[PDB]
């Protein structure tokens, strides 16, 4: 009931997070899948209403929604910001994440590593945005957040030195600026080493992005393999049924194939709809994460990484987005003795923004997230009431700065 | 025409397929009608043009 | 039944209870510090003072009304179990 | 335009919120359910393709997702912390929840 | 087969809804238990403690 623990050091750690944003856009045609360009099959299928119009409409909707997801995830900037030719960011090194002119498609190194890691009635529609353009969006976002902080997320980008920006972030996470300004080299070295560790780990993980591709490929393969099932008929080939029978009883062997293939197609469409809904939810989460961790600083716990979030970097992926969350992790704690308030001259004194700590003989005032003792004065404390109601009060003096200097 | 070579059907060939009736230009505007693979179609003037969509206005932050 | 099988959950109920107990112990002892890394112990009264400081109330209010706050919290906790002795949302899924 | 109201007292309130996290993991044998262990029914069902494979895949995915949901919801701590034997919590009483 | 397909589809939809609820529960745990939330009416009625 009278002991507290306060960290005396910290480590800068960067962690990754992968979120799928979109899936491959596919379209199917009944007249060539179910029928395979045969007039009699189309004539029989005309009796089944307009199921295929519904299927085509659903597939078109889920294809458009993919581009909508990509646009809402990546197109969150108006200008295309560029990093200055000279790169002096107070010792911080972003060479591994900035675009490289020599690399193909002007991708970054980590983007290149991520990209290297991973008919008959069926068509695949290319996405509206190519990989180069998504990479350009990511580069613009990276340059804007490097050279302007969060200002460009609310309007016109305002430049500011990077060290001062990270000082802003430290102030935001409850640590004073002097802690950062007196440890700039150590913080920069830790950040560089942590960035290098991510590169090393990736060069040696992308299961979530692999899963959607595998599921889509499996669904397409199952749909194709379903074409070789007789469904209790003579054969799975339309031409075998055509040129071996006249059409008063061959018409009975045809409709069975029609209903089987229709059932398979409807099942595929339903599964695609459910998968698209899940992908849309993931894309909404990714867009929210981008808007709240990249264009600003989030106070939500464990939303933009593990620890106290400082700032994040986005990176493009084949069909997703990869975030590099930079978090502040305290370490090397020593525990002391603590009192809720100090009684002096019959009055109780409370700390303005810190806590009272004692190393055994003396009492100090320090910030809660970093050990930095200070002499207790009347400038960092305020007075409220008398020292007989609060439980745990200890006796100590409060140094008034005015009295000695005046006399 | 989707995923069809232009020889199998003024005339412009893109990644999305073969496009007939649009004039390819060297400019870069905002996307009006999305064609696919970074190509968009718009009606300037009286006529239809096909171009590459422009991501946005270029801006370099005076950083020091 | 005829081909129907009910798989057992991977995490047995006492294991989930142990997770909940660990979470409660961490919250009571270290406040929110254990959620960002190593758990840092702190008296509960000062953690509650922090929490009042987070909602725009000066921390002296807690140090002057600790007994009243504790009594109100205990009364509310006691009222919770009486209110329990509802869960329709869980029953609907089953 | 010149009147304000300031509270002079406060109350501590606790409210319960209940959220489902998992379902019952069920797996159904397609062949035995459809046919009931008869060879002829299995032979006719073999003509229908691989529907049972897809059904089993979907059910297995749901079953795995249930455990993943439980792990995400609850396994958010690295070490199993234990409360001290004493209960000096400044007058707060957690006996009903410990 | 039709009955089994209907059952599987309904189970898939229910599982998606339950997964959404579980994600909400995980977020609520991370933001109300592991820290103090300033979001209004997210961790109860009033000012969350
Ligand atoms: C805080 O931690 C950092 C690193 O965790 C310490 O810096 C290390 O100091 C040792 C001692 O000379 C060196 O061998 C290492 O190379 C340093 N690491 C880096 C990355 O420079 C630092 O000394 C610690 N500060 C305190 C006050 O303990
Ligand atoms: C930022 O880090 C990169 C490496 O991640 C540095 O680039 C390499 O630096 C070494 C050291 O001189 C050279 O030998 C390599 O040729 C560089 N290029 C590579 C490895 O592709 C870069 O110099 C660092 N930035 C600064 C300002 O030092
Ligand atoms: C905080 O103070 C406690 C109280 O002594 C320390 O906890 C003990 O540490 C010793 C050394 O490893 C153990 O043998 C005891 O089992 C611990 N618990 C007790 C005595 O109840 C703790 O080490 C201190 N924290 C730090 C970071 O030094
Ligand atoms: C607790 O901190 C105080 C800080 O004032 C220490 O007191 C000083 O310690 C230094 C180091 O030996 C001496 O040179 C000074 O003369 C001491 N007094 C003052 C007024 O500065 C004290 O030693 C510390 N105690 C422990 C156990 O660490
Ligand atoms: C803190 O200091 C005050 C006054 O300096 C102490 O109050 C005195 O306590 C003694 C012994 O209990 C009494 O004989 C005096 O009459 C008290 N004086 C006043 C003005 O109250 C108080 O006990 C000290 N607290 C601690 C923990 O040492
Ligand atoms: C603020 O509210 C508290 C409780 O709602 C009041 O304390 C009550 O005071 C009455 C009057 O003597 C007692 O009968 C009750 O038993 C008290 N409640 C408890 C829980 O002890 C308090 O008077 C109100 N006003 C102030 C200024 O605190
Ligand atoms: C914490 O609350 C529990 C009840 O929720 C208290 O246990 C009861 O204590 C009263 C006397 O104060 C007994 O009459 C009851 O029989 C107890 N109920 C039990 C043991 O189930 C417990 O005493 C409280 N803790 C403290 C430190 O006051
Ligand atoms: C702390 O607990 C000890 C018992 O070990 C007790 O003597 C002391 O009065 C308590 N102090 C406070 C402020 O609760
Ligand atoms: C289209 O046809 C032309 C003419 O043979 C050929 O050169 C070209 O490779 C084909 N494919 C594309 C994409 O132009
Ligand atoms: C567009 O520019 C290219 C130069 O890269 C030129 O070869 C081509 O003729 C131009 N086309 C038009 C329509 O201006």
What is the structure about, briefly put?
By secondary structure, chain A is of the alpha+beta class.
Account of the protein in words:
This is part of a larger assembly, with 5 copies of chain A. Chain A has 407 residues and is of the alpha+beta class. Helices cover 42% and strands 21% of the residues of chain A. Chain A is built from 12 helices and 13 strands. In chain A, helix 3 runs parallel beside helix 11 (250-294) and helix 9 runs antiparallel to helix 11 (250-294). The longest helix of chain A has 45 residues, at 250-294. Chain A is elongated and about 120 Å long. Chains in contact: A-B, A-C, A-D, A-E, C-D, C-E, D-E. The A-C interface holds A 1-7, 301-302, 306-308, 329-331, 333, 335, 338, 340-341, 348, 350, 355, 368, 384-385, 389-392 and C 32, 35-38, 40-43, 45-46, 49-50, 58-60, 63-64, 66. Strand 3 of chain A pairs parallel with strand 7 (58-60) of chain B, so a sheet runs across the interface. The site of a molecule of 2 linked components (NAG-NAG) has 5 residues of chain A, from helix 8. Chain E: Disulfide bonds join 32-43. Chain E: This is Spike protein S2'.
Main traits of this protein?
part of a larger assembly; 5 chains; 407 residues; alpha+beta; six-stranded antiparallel β-sheet; 13 strands; elongated; binds a molecule of 2 linked components (NAG-NAG); binds 2-acetamido-2-deoxy-beta-D-glucopyranose
